[PDB]
DNA sequence: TGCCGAGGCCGCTCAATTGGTCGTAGACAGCTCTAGCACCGCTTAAACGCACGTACGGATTCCGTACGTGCGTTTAAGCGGTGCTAGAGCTGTCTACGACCAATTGAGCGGCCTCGGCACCGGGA
DNA sequence: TCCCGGTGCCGAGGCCGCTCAATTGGTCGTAGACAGCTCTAGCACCGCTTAAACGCACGTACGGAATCCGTACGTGCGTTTAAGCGGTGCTAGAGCTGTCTACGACCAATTGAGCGGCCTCGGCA
C-alpha cells in the first residue's frame, strides 16, 4: 500500500521524497531516487545500531545512549572515516 | 519532522537477527543523535546527488545519482553492504 | 576575567577525559587561549548566521550551522 | 601516590558524558567574547545555543588534549607542556590563537 | 566560459596604482589558477547563499544572502574590506 | 552601458547572474544580488593580486605565476584562513 | 612493485621541499604507504565520479571533484 | 638540496612511475579493469599527492623538531598522520 | 639571436540588456506568548591557595650505527614517433517518466498515561 | 572497593484521535536514454638520449640509553567563592498570520561585449 512498506524498508519513502523535492536538490527527483535513498539511510542506521550493539554487549547497557553511538562511530574504521568530523551531544569518549 | 518512529522501526527489526533480542530502546538524547545522524547523512547524500546531477548536467537525480552519492559518502565495506541491501529494497519495490 | 571562567580544574577535567596524566602550568593559559580562538571563530560564524536571519537570539541552529561551516557537525540539536 | 588518583580520574571522566566546563562561566565567556571581541552588543543566547557551543568547544578541547597527550607520549614525556599543545594545534589544522 | 578577460581587467585596474614599471601581466598558468580561484570562491559564496536561503526559508538569494555568504566565506579584516568595497559598488550601481 | 560598467566593476554582472541561475543555487535571484557577488569576487581577486605584488615586489619579475598566488594565499592570515585547503597547480611552496 | 616505483630519491625530494634534513631509512616505506592510502581514497572517489559519468576515463575534473569531496580543493585544472 | 627544491615548482615524483602507481592502485586495490587515465587527470592527481606528502613531511619535521631530534623517523610520520586528519595507511 | 606566447585586432556570434506584464515572494505590521534575562539567597560543592615532597623534565656524556655524501655503474623515465581505436562528446528522435492535480485516506504527530530501568542508596561482602 | 537488594523517579513505550501528508490514477509534456557520427586523446611499443636511481665504501654526526639535580607539578587540607537552582518577575523579541506591493520570471526585441581565430613583436631560452 505505502511505498515505504512495499519496498521492505522501515524509512519513509514519502517523507524522504518530500524532503528531496523541497530541499531544492534538483528540479526533478526520479521515482527510484527516494526509495533507494530511504534504503541507504535505513541500512546505515541498521549498521550504526549493529556496531553499537557489538561494542555494547560488554557494557550490557540495555538502552542506546549517545555514548554508545559515539563508540560505534569512533571504533569501526569505515564508520570512523564516514563520521570523522562528528561530535555528539553528551558523547563522552570512545575507549 | 523527525525520523524518530522510523529509527524505532529499524531498531526493532535489527533486534530480530541480533542474539540480544532485547527491545533495546534508544534514549531520548540518543534518539535525537540518531535523528540528526539520519538528517546529516541524508543531507550529505542528497547534496552529493545534486552535485552529481549538476556534473552530469541533468535536471533529475535518478537512482544512478543517489547510488553514486551513497558510494561517495559511505565508502568501503559498509558502503558496499548498504548499497547492496539498498539495491535489494529498490528491486523489491520496483517489481511491484 | 573572561577565560578565568575556564578554571584550572576545568582544564584538568577536560584533559583527564581527553587522556593526559600530568598537565604543565603553561598548558592552562595555552588551552584557554585556544578555546578562546575556537570560540572566536565559531561565534563569528554563528553571529553571522543569526544577524542574517534578522534576529538577535543566537539559536542552537545557528551554532550547529556555524560549526558545520568548519566541518565539525553537531548531532543532537536539529 | 603521585599518580595513584590519575588513573581513577581518567577512568571516572571517561566513563561519564557530562559537560566538564562549568556552565555559567563558559556562558559568561561566550557573552563576554561576543561583546568584547566581536563588539556586537545586546545579543541574547538561546540556552540550547550556549549548550551546543559548550559541548562542541569542550569536545574540541578534549580532542586537542588527546592530540596533546599523543604529542607528549611521542616526545617520551608524561607531562603535556605548551610545546605539546602548540604541536597538536599546528599539526592538526586547528584554529591557532592570535598571540 | 572563463573569467580570463575580467581578471585581466581587474589586474590592470589594480595596477594603475601598483608597480607601474610595467603592466604586471599574469602568466597563462597563473590565469588558470586565478580563474579557478574565482570559480571556487563564487561556488563557495553561492553555496553559502543557498544554505542561507534554505535557512531563512526563502526562494531568492537577495543581497542579504550574498552579503552573509561573503561574511562567512571571506572572514576577518579582508572580509570587511571586500564587503565594504562591494557595498560601494552596489550603491554606485543602484544610484544609476 | 552594461551592468558591469554601471557598477564600476570589471567582472561580468551578466555572466555571474547566469551562473547563479543555471547553477540552481536558488529558485529566484534578485538582480541586486549578482551585482554584489560580482563586486565581492572582483575585490577578492584584486586583493589576492595586491598581496601577490606586496609579497613579490622584491623579485620584480614583472609577472604573476602560480607560485606568486600560492605565497599570497598562504602568507596573510586572512587569505590563509580563506584558502587553507587550496593546492595550486604548479604552485610550489610559500617562501 | 608499482608502489616501489616512487623512488627513494623522489621521497627525499618531497621531504626536502617539506623542510626535512635527515630522513630515517624507515620513513621511505611509511611515506610510500601513506601515499598509497591517500591515492586509494582519492582514486576510489575519482572512479566513482567517473563511473557515474557512464564513461571509462577518469578525467581531470573527476579527480578535482574527488579531492573537493575529501577536502583539498585543487586550483587550475578547469 | 632544500633550497633548490623548495623554491622551484617542477614536479618531484617522476611522472611515469607515479602514473604506474595510480594505474595499478585503480586496477588492483579498486580492481576496476580497463580504466583509462586522461593525462590531465594523472597530472592533477600527482600534483595533489605530492602536495599532500609535502605537507605530511612539513608536519613530520614539526614533530621531529618537537622531539628535540634532527632526523625524522617512523614514529614522527605516524604522529603527523594521526594528529592531522590524514588518511592512515592500510 | 631568433622564437614563440602575452597581448592586441577582427569579425561573427551568442549572451547581455531592456521594456512590459502577472503573480508571487517577501517585507512589513500587528498579535502572541515563549523564554531569555535578571536577581537573590542558600546550599554546597567546587575552586583556590598553600604546604610539601616525589618524580619528572631536561641537561649531560657517550657509544653504536644509521644517516648523508661521494663515487661508479645500471636503469628506466622522458620524448618524439606514428599508429590504432576505444570511447568521449555532440546531435537528433522519441518515449518512459515525472510534474501537476483533485480526491482519497491512513500513517504520523502530539497528548496522556504506565511501569520497568536506572540513578541512588544503603548494606554487605 | 565491588557487588548487589530496595527505592523513587522518569523516560521508553503504548493507545487515541485529529490531522495533514502520502497515495492513486490521468494528462501532458519533456528529459534523458539511446543510437549514430566524428575524431580527440589516450595508449602502446620502440629506440635513443640522457639523467636519475642504485649500490656500495666511508665516517661522522646523530639517536638513544644511561645518570644526575632541580623544580614543578600532583596530592591533601582548610578557606573562600560562586555555580547552580528554582522561583519569580519583566519584557524583548522570535515567530506566526495576514496583508500589499515591489520585484523577478518570462517573452520579445534588441544590441554589443566576448568568444575564438589570427597576428605581432618583445621577453626570454
Numbering used by the authors:
A (entry chain C), F (entry chain G): 12 to 106
B (entry chain D), E (entry chain H): 28 to 123
C (entry chain F), G (entry chain B): 20 to 97
D (entry chain E): 43 to 141
H (entry chain A): 51 to 140
Question: How do the authors describe this structure?
Answer:
Giardia lamblia is a pathogenic unicellular eukaryotic parasite that causes giardiasis. Its genome encodes the canonical histones H2A, H2B, H3, and H4, which share low amino acid sequence identity with their human orthologues. The NCP is composed of 145–147 base-pairs of DNA wrapped around a histone octamer, containing two molecules each of the four histone proteins, H2A, H2B, H3 and H4 (5–9). The H2A–H2B dimer and the H3–H4 tetramer are assembled via packing of the histone fold domains, and two H2A–H2B dimers associate with one H3–H4 tetramer to form the histone octamer at the core of the NCP.
In the present study, we determined the cryo-electron microscopy (cryo-EM) structure of the G. lamblia NCP at 3.6 Å resolution, and characterized the stabilities of the nucleosome and histone octamer in solution. The overall structure of the G. lamblia NCP is similar to that of the canonical NCP. All G. lamblia histones adopted the characteristic histone fold domain, but with notable deviations from the backbone human histones in the NCP, including the G. lamblia-specific insertions of six and two residues in H2B and H3, respectively. A 125 base-pair DNA region (out of 145 bp) was wrapped around the histone octamer in a left-handed supercoil, with a mean RMSD of 2.01 Å from the canonical NCP with the same DNA sequence. The DNA ends of the G. lamblia NCP could not be resolved, whereas these regions are well defined in the structures of canonical NCPs, suggesting that the entry-exit DNA regions of the G. lamblia NCP are more flexible and accessible. We also noticed that the lengths of the DNA ends of the G. lamblia NCP that could not be resolved were asymmetric, even though the 601L DNA is palindromic and the assembled histones have full dyad symmetry. The H2A C-terminal hydrophobic residues from 111–117 are important for the H3 binding in the human canonical NCP, and these are replaced by hydrophilic residues, including four charged sidechains, from 108–114 in G. lamblia H2A. This appears to weaken the binding of the H2A C-terminal region to the H3 αN helix, and thus the H2A C-terminal region is not resolved on either face of the structure. In the G. lamblia NCP structure, this insertion extends the H2B α1 helix and L1 loop. Surprisingly, the shape of this acidic patch is substantially different from that of the human NCP, because the G. lamblia H2B insertion forms a ridge that deepens the acidic patch.
